[PDB]
Structures are given as C-alpha cells and as structure tokens.
Amino acid sequence: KWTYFGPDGENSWSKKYPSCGGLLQSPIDLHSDILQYDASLTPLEFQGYNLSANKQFLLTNNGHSVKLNLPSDMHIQGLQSRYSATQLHLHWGNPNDPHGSEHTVSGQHFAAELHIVHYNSDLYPDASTASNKSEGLAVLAVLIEMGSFNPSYDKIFSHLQHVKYKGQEAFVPGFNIEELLPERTAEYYRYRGSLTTPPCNPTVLWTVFRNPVQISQEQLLALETALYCTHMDDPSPREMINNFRQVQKFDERLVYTSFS
Amino acid sequence: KWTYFGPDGENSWSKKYPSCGGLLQSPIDLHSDILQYDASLTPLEFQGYNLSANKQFLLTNNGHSVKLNLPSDMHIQGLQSRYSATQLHLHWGNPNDPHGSEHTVSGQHFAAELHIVHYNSDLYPDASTASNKSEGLAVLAVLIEMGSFNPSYDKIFSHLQHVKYKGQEAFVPGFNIEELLPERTAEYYRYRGSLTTPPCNPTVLWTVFRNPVQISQEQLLALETALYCTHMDDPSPREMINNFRQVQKFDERLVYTSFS
Ligand SMILES: COc1c(F)c(S(N)(=O)=O)c(F)c(NC2CCCCCCC2)c1S(=O)(=O)CCCO
Ligand SMILES: COc1c(F)c(S(N)(=O)=O)c(F)c(NC2CCCCCCC2)c1S(=O)(=O)CCCO
Ligand SMILES: [Zn+2]
Ligand SMILES: [Zn+2]
Secondary structure, eight states, X not given: OOOSSSTTSGGGHHHHOGGGGSSSOSOOEEOGGGEEEOTTOOOOEXXXXXXOTTSEEEEEEOSSXXXXXXXXXXXXXXXXXXXXXXXXXXXXXXXXXXXOOSSEETTBOOXXXXXEEEEETTTOSSHHHHTTSTTOEEEEEEEEEXXXXXXXXXXXXXXXXXXXXXXXXXXXXXXXXXXXXXXXXXXXXXXXXXXSSTXXXXXXXXXXXXXXXXXXXXXXXXXXXXXBSSOTTOSSOXXXXXXXXXXXXXXXXXXXXXXX | OOOSSSTTSGGGHHHHOGGGGSXXXXXXEEOGGGEEEOTTOOOOEEESOBOOTTSEEEEEEOSSSEEEEOOTTOEEESSSSOEEEEEEEEXXXXXXXXXXXXXXXXXXXXSEEEEEEEEETTTOSSHHHHTTSTTOEEEEEEEEEESSOOHHHHHHHTTGGGSOSXXXXXXXXXXXXXXXXXXXXXXXXXXXXXXXXXXXXXXXXXXXXXXXXXXXXXXXXXXXXXXXXXXXXXXXXXXXXXXXXXXXXXXXXXXEXXXX
C-alpha cells in the first residue's frame, strides 16, 4: 500500500501513516550547519556479529527492500541500553542514477546504504513491541560507494537471484556481519530520528558511520537489477529501484559527531 | 492550512491538495546524471521587463512568501507560446542554516531563490485559469548566493519592513526586472515540473538559470528576519523562514541544458 514511485509514493505516505508527516523524520542531509561535536559519545562495540556458519538466516524480498533476519544474540554495546539485532536491509538508486543512499553528506548521495536494525532489548521483548515505543530502535547506517569488489557484501548479493519477487525467501548461512562495517567505526554522526519507511515511527536512534565502504561497479549494478517490488503473478511488474526516501527538513535541531 | 513546518508541512500537503502527491513535482536536484545538452534551447527574450518608474507595483506578504504583482505586458518570447508575467516571489532559509533555495545544484543549496511566474496568455485569459491547464505556466528561477550587495534586489528588499505581517501591502516603483537576472541568461536548465506550493499543479515549464546572483549578508539577513507568516496582532508570532520545498524524486526523466 506504499511505494517510492508514483501515486502511492512518499508524498502520500502521510495519508495512511500519519507519523510520516510528523516529528523527528529521517533521513537527513548531514551538513556543517546542523552538526555539533559531542566529546561524550563513545565507540560502539559489536558483539555476536560473527554469526555461526552452521546456522542459517532468512533473506526476504518484502516488496520494498531485501532484508536479512538477524538473531537477538547479536547486540551493540555503547548506548544507554543494550540493543539487540533484528534485521539488516539496503537502499539503492538505479543504473542511470546510481546514487541511492538515504542520508547525504554535505548534499551528496552515496551509491547505496546498508541499515542494521536493532531494538532495545532491556526495555522490550521483541522488535515489533519496541518499534513504536520510546527509545525502541537503533539503526546503524553504512554508506556505500563504488570502488573495489567487496567479498563480504557478496555474501548477501550472491543470493539475490533466489528472492527476485515480493514474498520470496531464501536462507543464507551465518557470516561475520562486522565485515560489512567501515574503517574507524568510532567516527560517526548520531541523531534522533525515525523509520525511513511507513509507519515512520519517531523511535530510531541513528548512527551513521563517517567513512563509507566500497563495492565494485559490477556489484552495484547487480543489486540495482536483481529485484522486483511485485509478486510473481502481478500483471504490472515493477523493478526494485530508487528505494530510498528523500531527505527531510531538519530545523532547530542537531546531529552530534564523535569526531571534531 | 499549509505550512513548511510541523503537522501541516510538506509531507502532509497531499492530504489537502491531490496534485502535491502526483506526477511532475518540483523542485529537483540538478546533477550530472540527469542532464542532457539540447542545442535547440535558444535564449529567451525578456519583453516589457523595464517597468515604468512612474508606476507603482503591489508587494504583498501572503503568509507564505513576499510577492510582487507584475503586469501582463511583461512577457517571455522564445517558447512555443507567449507567456505573460503575473508575479514574482522568493524562497529562503534561516540565519542558523542560510541555505534555502528550492532547486539544488549537485546537491548544494544556494542561499535563496527568486521565481518570476508567467502564464500562457496565448492559450488562457489569465493566470488562475491557466494554472491547472496544459502548458499553463512558465517560471523563471534565479539562484541567489550570499556575497556582494545587490542594488537591484534592494529595490524590493528596501520595502520589507512595511510588509512584515500577513496581508500587509506596500508599493514598489517600477524598475527593470531584467536587473534581477544573472549573467549569461542564455545558459539555463529546462524541465517540465510543477508549482512548488499547493496546489502543486504539474503545469510549469521551469527555466533555472545556470549562474547565481549575489546579495549581501545584510540583505540575506533582512529577507530571513523581516517577515512573519501571521497577522500583525497574533500574540504568538510565526516567523517566515525555511519557505522552500525539499527536492522531489526525478526518475526516468531528464533536465535539458543550453550549455555542455
Ligand atoms: C526496508 O524497510 C525498512 C526500513 F527502511 C527501515 S529503516 N530504514 O531502518 O528505518 C526499518 F527499520 C525496517 N524495519 C524495522 C524493524 C524493526 C521493528 C519492526 C517494524 C519494522 C521496522 C524496514 S522493513 O524492511 O522491516 C519494512 C517495514 C515496513 O513497515
Ligand atoms: C509563494 O507561493 C507561490 C509559489 F511558490 C509559486 S512557484 N514556486 O513558482 O511554483 C507560485 F507560482 C505562486 N503563484 C502562482 C500564480 C499563478 C497561478 C495561480 C495559482 C498560484 C500559482 C505562489 S503564490 O505566492 O501565488 C501562493 C500560491 C498559493 O497557492
Ligand atoms: Zn533502511
Ligand atoms: Zn516559488
């Protein structure tokens, strides 16, 4: 009931999902005028990110992105509460305009963006319960640019042809999710925002790493061309492209940086 | 019942104005991937722009912008139809983030933007009738950067302290509107889009000049701090700031340029 293109696109989300027209919306443009160094921000620690290769994790095309389910055994230290993983997914552009990150830096998109979603497991029993609650979610965002082939991202991309259409699912063996993170994870942007998709709940603590990772031109094109938003039996297929939200207004508020 | 900030802000405009969630929406980011040089794009001619110093033209705070009424003897020649002037107005940011142009260039906002609104006088009798019809409108856009004082823009700005509140009106003596335009008007971006405010009609032929103009720090600050969205006797004033729409998705479509 929502898309990124056409009559049900992002300008209309607020009709059935009021929080999409509400407070604390994400994503945003990270730029000098709204940044402040905060010396009390501390480095995150990534625990249980090395998932067992003898276990398996479901990859799903949900019609909006490709998601990988993650175990609650995976968690972040360094926030006020323990946040445990629930899923990761990506956002990207299209072959003719391969600049589909959600966040921008100084007005610039990156090629794509990876989000690793966690929920506050000290307060809430599961992500669904946390999702619309105070302090419920924390998302790690990795900005992606074109460059060297990235074997670690290929551990996701090499399975995409098995989830081409909405609803399709495939298992992926465990691998080390930390390999998907950039250099100097200590350096990041942090702000209070929202889910970037309906329902747009204003319940996400965002951490956007300063430094991008690289994937090759061939990997980017593979991601942009692999998937469809529609079911196999849909008479009007739609390619999964440009599945990122435009940046939001961000006035009389601040993003905090862990680097001066 | 629409604003740029809060529950009646731009993500909610579609609830009130159907075209705001429709096709062909403006403004957009002007960037390499969606540009295409078109040698058929020849210089516009600005006719009747030298308004008589012996006449007065109405400046109005309409609660959303400051507009100057323009006579229908001003017109643009060079497009398929003649388009005659109806008004000009501005968009800007705020002192803490003085980057409130509507259009962006390679992801960068300029300080402000001037729009000179015209209607298709060959097809339609007046601007209101044209506004929701095929090829109804044509808007000229000038990007404004902060730098040197601009005597020509000060012919408008010098009256801002007499139109501080909604509904208030002042007279501006005629002057040569062409003085508001930048260097090398032959260089421009052209695309089909929409009004950037409700009702968001997709009926505008946009011409964005390549080169910005400059206004001083003091001029920009006056524009950002002189005006209120509310009436003179509200005990709860609302400043007129950040009156620009975020850039829209622009996919499977091109902006044509008169420069390479
Ligand atoms: C790709 O869509 C996103 C998404 F973009 C984001 S973002 N960018 O991190 O805010 C998400 F967080 C989620 N997942 C969250 C999971 C934890 C709470 C349970 C509710 C869903 C939110 C998802 S989703 O694939 O699950 C689809 C949700 C439709 O409501
Ligand atoms: C500042 O608001 C704008 C505006 F932003 C733009 S834009 N950026 O060029 O699309 C406008 F064109 C207009 N005027 C057009 C006048 C000709 C048609 C009649 C309907 C209004 C469109 C106006 S307005 O001040 O008149 C307020 C319109 C409220 O609906
Ligand atoms: Zn996401
Ligand atoms: Zn305008």
